[PDB]
Design a protein around this motif. Structure first.
Motif, PDB file in Angstrom:
ATOM      1  N   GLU A  83      10.666   4.262 -21.543  1.00 24.47           N
ATOM      2  CA  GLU A  83       9.330   4.247 -20.963  1.00 24.47           C
ATOM      3  C   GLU A  83       9.005   2.937 -20.269  1.00 24.47           C
ATOM      4  O   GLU A  83       8.043   2.887 -19.497  1.00 24.47           O
ATOM      5  N   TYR A 140       7.873   7.073 -16.448  1.00 25.70           N
ATOM      6  CA  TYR A 140       7.145   8.304 -16.713  1.00 25.70           C
ATOM      7  C   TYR A 140       5.674   8.210 -16.345  1.00 25.70           C
ATOM      8  O   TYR A 140       4.986   9.240 -16.315  1.00 25.70           O
ATOM      9  N   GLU A 141       5.180   7.016 -16.059  1.00 25.60           N
ATOM     10  CA  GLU A 141       3.823   6.817 -15.586  1.00 25.60           C
ATOM     11  C   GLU A 141       3.754   6.667 -14.077  1.00 25.60           C
ATOM     12  O   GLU A 141       2.650   6.693 -13.517  1.00 25.60           O
ATOM     13  N   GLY A 142       4.902   6.505 -13.423  1.00 31.16           N
ATOM     14  CA  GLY A 142       4.953   6.405 -11.982  1.00 31.16           C
ATOM     15  C   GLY A 142       4.525   5.078 -11.406  1.00 31.16           C
ATOM     16  O   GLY A 142       4.081   5.042 -10.256  1.00 31.16           O
ATOM     17  N   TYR A 152      11.136   6.086 -10.828  1.00 30.15           N
ATOM     18  CA  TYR A 152       9.812   5.783 -11.358  1.00 30.15           C
ATOM     19  C   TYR A 152       8.743   6.658 -10.709  1.00 30.15           C
ATOM     20  O   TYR A 152       7.716   6.151 -10.241  1.00 30.15           O
ATOM     21  N   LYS A 167       6.184   9.734 -11.622  1.00 25.82           N
ATOM     22  CA  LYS A 167       5.644  10.589 -12.674  1.00 25.82           C
ATOM     23  C   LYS A 167       5.777  12.051 -12.260  1.00 25.82           C
ATOM     24  O   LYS A 167       5.291  12.445 -11.196  1.00 25.82           O
ATOM     25  N   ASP A 200      12.841  16.627 -12.986  1.00 27.19           N
ATOM     26  CA  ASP A 200      12.909  15.243 -12.520  1.00 27.19           C
ATOM     27  C   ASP A 200      14.368  14.908 -12.217  1.00 27.19           C
ATOM     28  O   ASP A 200      15.035  14.153 -12.919  1.00 27.19           O
ATOM     29  N   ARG A 233       2.698   3.024  -6.892  1.00 27.40           N
ATOM     30  CA  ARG A 233       2.387   4.138  -7.771  1.00 27.40           C
ATOM     31  C   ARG A 233       2.849   5.411  -7.080  1.00 27.40           C
ATOM     32  O   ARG A 233       2.578   5.605  -5.889  1.00 27.40           O
ATOM     33  N   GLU A 272       3.421   9.721  -7.841  1.00 28.92           N
ATOM     34  CA  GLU A 272       3.207  10.828  -8.756  1.00 28.92           C
ATOM     35  C   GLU A 272       3.519  12.141  -8.064  1.00 28.92           C
ATOM     36  O   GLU A 272       2.970  12.440  -6.996  1.00 28.92           O
TER      37      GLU A 272
END
Length: 219
Positions: free
Chosen positions: A7, A35-37, A66, A68, A75, A210, A212
């Motif tokens: 993570e 997993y959070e992007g 990276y 999410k 993935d 970021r 996603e």
């Protein structure tokens, strides 16, 4: 692969490139939450500095492990590890400038290792890239789809201009795992890349991204 893609993950990157014939190298390190992007990269120009062109054409080349992903979208790029994946990109800018990129992503000693090769050509000498008139990317939506045993992404990417308006690029990238793993269907990835700090001549740069994945179908 949740055991090896943790993570919190770090990476190291090296780029060898040339833009309009100006050769350079960059080394960097990064870290983020796959997993959070989210992720941050710290880059240093190690050869060919200061660069006589806009940093912004290089920033999208500095990390798709990276992103999410919803649990029901495979993935693919995380699943490619530990062997990893390669990517190849073409960016066609509206004034005829071209950037092509090839990249290898691997996992070594618990960190991602990125090797990038970049060729930028045909930028007008008085255009916004060679005159450093750009001010960062607008948020992007990369449209993803499987094709020919690989994952493809297409973007209409927009660079803000200091004097107003935008400088557009059409981008297509192929991301190919080194071993067959499960490909997703079509979906979108919402991306926002920010330059969070830089020195005056852009030989030292930090950037945050970021990313996603979101369903394109399903209601």
């Amino acid at each position: 692969n949740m055991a090896i893609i943790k993570e919190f993950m770090r990476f190291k990157v090296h780029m060898e490139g040339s833009v309009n014939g100006h050769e350079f190298e960059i080394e960097g390190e990064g870290e983020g939450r796959p997993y959070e992007g989210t992720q941050t990269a710290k880059l240093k120009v190690t050869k060919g500095g200061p660069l006589p062109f806009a940093w912004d054409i290089l920033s999208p080349q500095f990390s798709k492990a990276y992103v999410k992903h919803p649990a029901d979208i495979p993935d693919y790029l995380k699943l490619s590890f530990p062997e990893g994946f390669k990517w190849e990109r073409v960016m066609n800018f509206e004034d005829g400038g071209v950037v092509t990129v090839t990249q290898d992503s691997s996992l070594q000693d618990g960190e991602f290792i990125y090797k990038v090769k970049l060729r930028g050509t045909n930028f007008p000498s008085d255009g916004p890239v060679m005159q450093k008139k750009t001010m960062g990317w607008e948020a992007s939506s990369e449209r993803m789809y499987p094709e020919d045993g690989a994952l493809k992404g297409e973007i209409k990417q927009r660079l803000k201009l200091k004097d107003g308006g935008h400088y557009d690029a059409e981008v297509k990238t192929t991301y190919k795992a080194k071993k067959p793993v499960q490909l997703p269907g079509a979906y979108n990835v919402n991306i926002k890349l920010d330059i969070t700090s830089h020195n005056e001549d852009y030989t030292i740069v930090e950037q945050y991204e970021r990313a996603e994945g979101r369903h394109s179908t399903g209601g």
